[PDB]
């Protein structure tokens with residue numbers, strides 16, 4: 559389809575509990591409304607749903623590899639390095655986040671906080687408890703369980719048995735003020751789902767996938783060298799607004815879901831102490847996004863099973879298609895139904 563979200567605005571969704579029970583079905587719905595055209599969409603769950611009953615058992619959890627984020631650069635163009643530090647607990651990380659050195663500054667509004675982020679990026683290197691293999695969900699949670707979404711990304715584990723952490727498994731993100739994730743797309747241009755468990759907000763910048771190539775030309779212009787897959791390049795919105803790169807901004811609060819879409823470039827930072835949970839997933843539409851992307855997943859099993867008419871032409875390298883970033887995804891295909899019956 560097309561012309562659903564022609565402005566490519568970041569859309570916010572508030573489903574009822576009945577719309578919330580099927581995860582894959584609701585992803586097809588928000589794409590039928592055009593959420594995928596912004597590269598990022600917010601999902602506000604109903605109040606009856608709570609992923610964990612209490613967050614007081616978490617002080618003794620281990621953060622195996624925290625990273626000190628050292629950012630260099632000037633004039634809205636930066637490069638961040640991630641130096642690994644010693645292990646610590648969440649209680650220690652919380653006391654370090656609210657330390658005077660790392661605490662959230664005084665700010666009038668977000669515009670003030672955004673200004674102080676890009677002004678004080680170089681001066682202090684914050685600690686980010688990122689990429690922790692684990693989950694904070696309860697076991698009985700059956701709706702939107704990040705540890706088990708039951709999408710077609712399970713074909714990797716169900717057929718080839720490969721398990722990739724942060725992609726097949728959930729990751730945990732304990733943050734503090736100024737902790738940043740750089741401009742990037744998900745591995746193999748996969749989807750991603752991020753849920754903010756508790757704490758201070760997490761802000762997102764997102765570029766629509768139909769303009770992602772304009773950011774890639776911009777970054778190549780600054781460094782003469784898919785190097786943005788190093789995921790350590792920071793670009794200020796001042797620079798994007800100067801060269802005409804379309805982008806939108808939204809703030810994710812505690813208890814809200816964020817979906818990133820294939821070839822949706824995103825970047826952002828944490829306002830203060832928070833905990834986020836994230837994993838990757840896929841719909842039927844992603845298969846063509848993963849094919850054009852060639853952590854390296856082999857797309858062979860997806861094409862051999864769900865695109866079998868194109869398989870031999872893809873092995874011969876004669877399947878040259880152009881992605882239509884506006885087409886919504888399908889919910890089911892005859893090849894997918896007969897595959898679930900085989901398993």
Ligand SMILES: CN(c1ccccc1)c1ccc2c(c1)CCC[C@H]2CNc1cnccc1C(=O)O
Nearest residue numbers: 640686688731738739740752787788789790834
């Ligand atoms: C450099 N690096 C690397 C690159 C190549 C291979 C191996 C690792 C790397 C990779 C990942 C990260 C960081 C650094 C530094 C903190 C951030 C996380 C990703 N975090 C998010 C991603 N998307 C959305 C949100 C978030 C978030 O912070 O909530």
Ligand code: NI
Nearest residue numbers: 743744750824
């Ligand atoms: Ni990401």
